[PDB]
Design a protein around this motif. Structure first.
Motif, short mmCIF file in Angstrom:
data_model
loop_
_atom_site.label_atom_id
_atom_site.label_comp_id
_atom_site.label_asym_id
_atom_site.label_seq_id
_atom_site.Cartn_x
_atom_site.Cartn_y
_atom_site.Cartn_z
N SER A 187 -45.63 26.53 -39.20
CA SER A 187 -45.12 26.21 -37.86
C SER A 187 -44.16 25.02 -37.84
CB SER A 187 -46.28 25.96 -36.89
OG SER A 187 -45.75 25.75 -35.59
N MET A 188 -44.44 24.03 -38.67
CA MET A 188 -43.61 22.82 -38.74
C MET A 188 -42.53 22.87 -39.87
SD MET A 188 -44.60 21.09 -36.16
CE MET A 188 -43.70 19.64 -36.55
N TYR A 189 -42.34 24.03 -40.49
CA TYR A 189 -41.33 24.20 -41.53
C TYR A 189 -39.95 23.80 -41.03
CZ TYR A 189 -37.94 26.52 -44.64
OH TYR A 189 -36.92 26.82 -45.47
N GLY A 190 -39.37 22.78 -41.68
CA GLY A 190 -38.02 22.37 -41.38
C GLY A 190 -37.86 21.66 -40.04
N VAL A 191 -38.92 21.18 -39.40
CA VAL A 191 -38.79 20.59 -38.06
C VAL A 191 -38.69 19.09 -38.16
CG1 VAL A 191 -39.83 20.32 -35.75
CG2 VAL A 191 -40.10 22.55 -37.05
N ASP A 192 -37.56 18.55 -37.72
CA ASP A 192 -37.29 17.09 -37.67
C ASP A 192 -37.83 16.58 -36.34
OD1 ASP A 192 -36.16 14.46 -37.99
OD2 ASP A 192 -34.10 15.14 -37.41
N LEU A 193 -38.89 15.76 -36.36
CA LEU A 193 -39.57 15.28 -35.13
C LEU A 193 -39.05 13.95 -34.63
CD1 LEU A 193 -43.26 16.13 -35.97
CD2 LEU A 193 -41.83 17.16 -34.15
N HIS A 194 -38.81 13.87 -33.32
CA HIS A 194 -38.33 12.68 -32.66
C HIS A 194 -39.25 12.34 -31.47
CE1 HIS A 194 -34.08 12.77 -34.37
NE2 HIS A 194 -34.62 13.89 -34.80
N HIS A 195 -39.74 11.09 -31.40
CA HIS A 195 -40.39 10.56 -30.20
C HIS A 195 -39.48 10.47 -29.02
CE1 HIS A 195 -43.27 8.92 -33.28
NE2 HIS A 195 -44.07 9.58 -32.47
N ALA A 196 -40.00 10.96 -27.88
CA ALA A 196 -39.31 10.82 -26.62
C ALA A 196 -40.33 10.87 -25.45
CB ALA A 196 -38.27 11.92 -26.48
N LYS A 197 -39.83 10.62 -24.25
CA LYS A 197 -40.59 10.83 -23.01
C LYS A 197 -39.87 11.83 -22.12
CE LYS A 197 -42.78 6.34 -22.98
NZ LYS A 197 -43.28 5.19 -22.12
N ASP A 198 -40.64 12.67 -21.44
CA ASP A 198 -40.03 13.56 -20.45
C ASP A 198 -39.66 12.82 -19.15
OD1 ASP A 198 -42.27 13.40 -18.75
OD2 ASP A 198 -43.20 15.21 -19.69
N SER A 199 -39.20 13.60 -18.18
CA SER A 199 -38.89 13.12 -16.80
C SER A 199 -40.02 12.34 -16.07
CB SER A 199 -38.48 14.32 -15.96
OG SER A 199 -39.48 15.36 -16.02
N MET A 205 -42.93 14.83 -28.31
CA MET A 205 -41.99 14.87 -29.42
C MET A 205 -41.09 16.06 -29.30
SD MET A 205 -44.06 13.29 -32.34
CE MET A 205 -45.15 14.70 -32.65
N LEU A 206 -39.84 15.84 -29.67
CA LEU A 206 -38.83 16.87 -29.74
C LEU A 206 -38.58 17.21 -31.22
CD1 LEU A 206 -36.28 15.36 -27.15
CD2 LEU A 206 -37.88 17.25 -26.85
N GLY A 207 -38.55 18.49 -31.56
CA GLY A 207 -38.43 18.89 -32.94
C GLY A 207 -37.15 19.67 -33.01
N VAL A 208 -36.32 19.37 -34.02
CA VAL A 208 -35.02 20.00 -34.23
C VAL A 208 -35.12 20.90 -35.48
CG1 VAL A 208 -32.60 19.59 -34.29
CG2 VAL A 208 -34.09 17.79 -33.36
N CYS A 209 -34.69 22.14 -35.34
CA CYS A 209 -34.80 23.06 -36.44
C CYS A 209 -33.90 24.21 -36.24
CB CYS A 209 -36.24 23.53 -36.67
SG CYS A 209 -36.94 24.49 -35.39
N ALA A 210 -33.92 25.12 -37.20
CA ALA A 210 -33.03 26.30 -37.20
C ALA A 210 -33.29 27.13 -35.94
CB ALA A 210 -33.27 27.16 -38.45
N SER A 211 -34.54 27.23 -35.52
CA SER A 211 -34.81 28.14 -34.39
C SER A 211 -34.21 27.52 -33.09
CB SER A 211 -36.30 28.58 -34.32
OG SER A 211 -37.24 27.52 -34.27
N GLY A 212 -34.50 26.24 -32.87
CA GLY A 212 -33.94 25.55 -31.74
C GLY A 212 -34.49 24.17 -31.54
N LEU A 213 -34.54 23.73 -30.28
CA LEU A 213 -35.21 22.50 -29.89
C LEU A 213 -36.63 22.74 -29.40
CD1 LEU A 213 -34.79 19.38 -29.57
CD2 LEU A 213 -34.37 19.84 -27.05
#
Length: 283
Positions: A187-199, A205-213
């Motif tokens: 599930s976490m293959y290739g996912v670059d994780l970033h801390h953030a807060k929503d609205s 966390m936001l994860g950046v990968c081939a599939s999407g955000l």
């Protein structure tokens, strides 16, 4: 006229070279790829740590000196874009370097997985590196120097050995391909994780990968935006924004926003999203 550069490679060794003081990051990256006999180099990149101790990708289009202020030009060679299907890479070496990254991703805890999968992954690593199981080479001791997981148990060590016995006759190329068939579905293959807060100030966390955000709350994946659906990626100050058309008939546009710790964090996220969007369109 030159700067010494040091690059930690995926096997733990170090590459040292000199570049001209005004070199772009491409000059160093090309030297490293040459050292590695790596032809499929668009999947890879170099990271450095900035003055805040944050990891950053070195931008090959920009002068190294604008990015690394310190004269300590010390980098790590890593996978940047994890291919969604490693079997489609042209060269076995590319797949080997991908496997070295993934073993680190597993041992460090960045790529979680089940005991079952850890044991099967291990068994392929062992078949690749050691070849066929053999009692006259393989004592009870024979894999105590491999790390297969963040926390090692003997039940894991024993299952790896069991599965290794079954792989008799497998070439390192076949073993690596099986390793990658299994890893690429995690599930976490290739996912670059970033801390953030929503609205509403909730920590995600936001994860950046081939599939999407991807969006996580509490180790739970709670949303996903595929890149083709993402119409605009932007940042302003400490905020990151994506534009989408919600609803069944996509009749209106909506901008969703996230609050990062600082402008630099928002800019790093933005850059890594844009690069991923671009790479995986052209792929």
């Amino acid at each position: 006229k030159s700067m010494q550069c040091k690059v930690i490679l995926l096997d733990g060794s170090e590459y040292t070279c000199d570049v001209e003081k005004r070199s772009r990051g491409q000059v160093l990256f090309d030297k490293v790829c040459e050292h590695l006999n790596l032809l499929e180099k668009d999947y890879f990149g170099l990271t450095y740590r900035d003055a805040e101790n944050q990891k950053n990708w070195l931008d090959p289009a920009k002068e190294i000196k604008k990015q690394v202020r310190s004269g300590a030009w010390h980098f790590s060679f890593n996978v940047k874009f994890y291919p969604p299907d490693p079997a489609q890479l042209s060269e076995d070496i590319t797949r080997y370097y991908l496997c070295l990254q993934l073993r680190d991703d597993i041992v460090s805890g960045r790529l979680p997985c089940s005991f079952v999968t850890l044991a099967l992954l291990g068994s392929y690593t062992v078949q690749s590196e050691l070849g066929d199981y053999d009692p006259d080479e393989c004592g009870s001791d024979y894999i105590s120097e491999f790390r297969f997981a963040p926390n090692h148990t003997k039940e894991l060590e024993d299952k790896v050995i069991e599965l290794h016995k079954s792989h008799r006759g497998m070439t390192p190329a076949e073993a690596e391909m099986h390793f990658l068939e299994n890893a690429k579905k995690l599930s976490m293959y290739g996912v670059d994780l970033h801390h953030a807060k929503d609205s509403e100030g909730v920590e995600i966390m936001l994860g950046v990968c081939a599939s999407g955000l991807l969006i996580y709350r509490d180790r739970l994946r709670i949303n996903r935006f595929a890149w083709p659906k993402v119409l605009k990626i932007s940042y302003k100050r400490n905020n990151f924004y994506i534009k989408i058309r919600p609803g069944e008939f996509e009749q209106f546009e909506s901008t969703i926003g996230f609050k990062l710790p600082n402008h630099r964090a928002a800019k790093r996220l933005w850059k890594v999203c844009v690069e991923h969007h671009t790479f995986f369109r052209l792929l």
